Design a protein around this ligand. Structure first.
Ligand SMILES: C[As](C)(=O)[O-]
Ligand SMILES: [Ba+2]
Ligand SMILES: [Ba+2]
Length: 137
């Protein structure tokens, strides 16, 4: 029809005297009729991203991301639903991404990894075996 100039932040005119929140935002009424009304971000993460992932809420949207220790097989850094989820555990030992001390051997775990002595070396004082910072002698 026409276009109200006074639409509040995150809403768009639907005609000369009314607005509607943009996708991803909500207001008390389905149709906004005054500039005092507000369009608040909807937290999609509190309403499924699938395995090994986290949901991060944003303004007007949200993103699923593989959790730390996992990475998408498909390469996509962000996704929207379980159907697009390609997160798999990162094998830090095979990939050489681990930061183990030359005195230990990397041992892959799901979501993480650790470093162990060689089971003839022994851990230096104050540091347990089977940790990322393990150092032996
Ligand atoms: C693997 As999840 C989306 O429950 O943090
Ligand atoms: Ba949002
Ligand atoms: Ba792992």
């Amino acid at each position: 029809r026409g276009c109200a100039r006074w639409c509040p932040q995150d809403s768009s005119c639907v005609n000369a005297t009314a607005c509607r929140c943009n996708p991803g935002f909500s207001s008390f009424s389905e149709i906004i009729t005054t500039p005092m009304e507000t369009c608040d971000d909807i937290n999609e993460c509190a309403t499924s991203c699938g395995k090994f992932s986290d949901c991060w809420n944003t303004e007007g949207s949200y993103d699923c991301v593989c959790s730390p220790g996992y990475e998408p097989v498909s390469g996509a850094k962000t996704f929207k639903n379980e159907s697009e989820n390609t997160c798999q555990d990162v094998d830090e030992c095979s990939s050489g991404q681990h930061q183990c001390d030359s005195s230990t051997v990397c041992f892959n775990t799901v979501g993480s990894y650790s470093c162990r002595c060689r089971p003839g070396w022994k851990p230096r004082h104050g540091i347990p075996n089977n940790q990322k910072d393990t150092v032996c002698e």
